[PDB]
Amino acid sequence: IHVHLQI
Amino acid sequence: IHVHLQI
Amino acid sequence: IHVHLQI
Amino acid sequence: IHVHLQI
Amino acid sequence: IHVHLQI
Amino acid sequence: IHVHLQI
Amino acid sequence: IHVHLQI
Amino acid sequence: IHVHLQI
Amino acid sequence: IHVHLQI
Amino acid sequence: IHVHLQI
Amino acid sequence: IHVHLQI
Amino acid sequence: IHVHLQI
Ligand SMILES: [Zn+2]
Ligand SMILES: [Zn+2]
Ligand SMILES: [Zn+2]
Ligand SMILES: [Zn+2]
Ligand SMILES: [Zn+2]
Ligand SMILES: [Zn+2]
Ligand SMILES: [Zn+2]
Ligand SMILES: [Zn+2]
Ligand SMILES: [Zn+2]
Ligand SMILES: [Zn+2]
Ligand SMILES: [Zn+2]
Ligand SMILES: [Zn+2]
Fold first, then answer.
1. Radius of gyration over every alpha carbon of chain J, rounded to an integer in angstroms
2. Are C3 and J4 in contact (CB under 8 A)?
3. Cα–Cα distance measured from residue E5 to residue G4, given in angstroms and rounded to the nearest whole number
4. Closest Cα in chain G, distance from residue B2 (Å)
């Protein structure tokens, strides 16, 4: 599972 | 599963 | 599992 | 598991 | 396990 | 286990 | 903004 | 912004 | 910003 | 910014 | 900034 | 900045 967070 | 969050 | 955090 | 933190 | 902390 | 700290 | 991911 | 990841 | 990672 | 990692 | 690493 | 390492 790949989780990417960009804010 | 790939989850991407961009805001 | 890959977790990336960019803010 | 790879965890990356960039703030 | 790879943990990277960049702030 | 590789831990990297950069502040 | 609140983002929750549960799988 | 609050981001929660649970897998 | 609060980032929580639980896997 | 609070970052929590639990695996 | 609070960084917690638990594995 | 508080950094905690537990492996
Ligand atoms: Zn990825
Ligand atoms: Zn992505
Ligand atoms: Zn990454
Ligand atoms: Zn890595
Ligand atoms: Zn690194
Ligand atoms: Zn290293
Ligand atoms: Zn949530
Ligand atoms: Zn939160
Ligand atoms: Zn948390
Ligand atoms: Zn904290
Ligand atoms: Zn802590
Ligand atoms: Zn402390």
1. 7
2. no
3. 22
4. 11
Q: Which residue has the tokens 């790939």?
A: B2
Contact state of E1 with F1 under an 8 Å Cβ cutoff: yes
Contacts of A7 in chain I (CB under 8 A): 1
In the numeric block, which tokens belong to residue F1? 């286990």
C-beta neighbour count of K5 within 10 angstroms:
22
The DSSP H or E segment spanning D3 is strand D2-6
Cα(K5)–Cα(G4) distance, integer angstroms: 20
| Residue K1, token pair as written in the block | 């900034």
Residue J7 Cα to ligand 1 middle (Å): 16
Q: Is the Cα torsion angle C7, H3, B4, L7 positive or negative in sign?
A: positive
